[PDB]
Amino acid sequence: SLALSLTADQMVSALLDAEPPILYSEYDPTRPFSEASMMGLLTNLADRELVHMINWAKRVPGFVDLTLHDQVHLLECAWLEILMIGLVWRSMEHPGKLLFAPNLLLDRNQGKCVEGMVEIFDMLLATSSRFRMMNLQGEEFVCLKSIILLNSGVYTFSLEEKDHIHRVLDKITDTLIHLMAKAGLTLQQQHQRLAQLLLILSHIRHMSNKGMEHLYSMKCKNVVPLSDLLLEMLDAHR
């Protein structure tokens, strides 16, 4: 395993250069949004983001060193968490707004549509407000997102499964500490910030669960029909 050989500087670099691109929406502001149209835009966007996330995951240090039905398992559990924390991150410099795409910036009154998503929107906004408050760094973001990928599904697992996963998780922890140590933070400040960051993941898990249930609602509702990939990830919550 080379992920265990990586210095914390090399850890960040590998994670930074593995970042997915910010995709564009097929949004047409010439017309006022509705429900099916908005849901159609978000579904189309999220689906294309999923494709990039799957290829992002393969570049995450340690992830490649696992069997398929494990990578599959971790992605099945964490995909919405990763999509949400990515959305929150690129929405950081836009108070009261969610940047789904550079041409698709929404607040909580346009999200008031689509039925029952406005609650999730407020939670997404509150998280972005929290990242802004802490002044989250990109180096810290790529670590957190990689933690989400490896941690969220490790508890739902003969051949020493998780000792490698937890061990990679331990080095990402060391990387975060590194990062804070260079920022000029004292040891007490490092632990505290480490705690504050990881407690966010609990709320991110909560949003994902609510979002997961909300998506299950949406196409027994038969509005704008999902991508076949999203439905695959969606039927992993069963």
Partner: peptide, 9 residues
């Protein structure tokens, strides 16, 4: 299975 192609594709 789509997420079953994208992982090895």
């Amino acid at each position: 299975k789509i997420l079953h192609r994208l992982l090895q594709d």
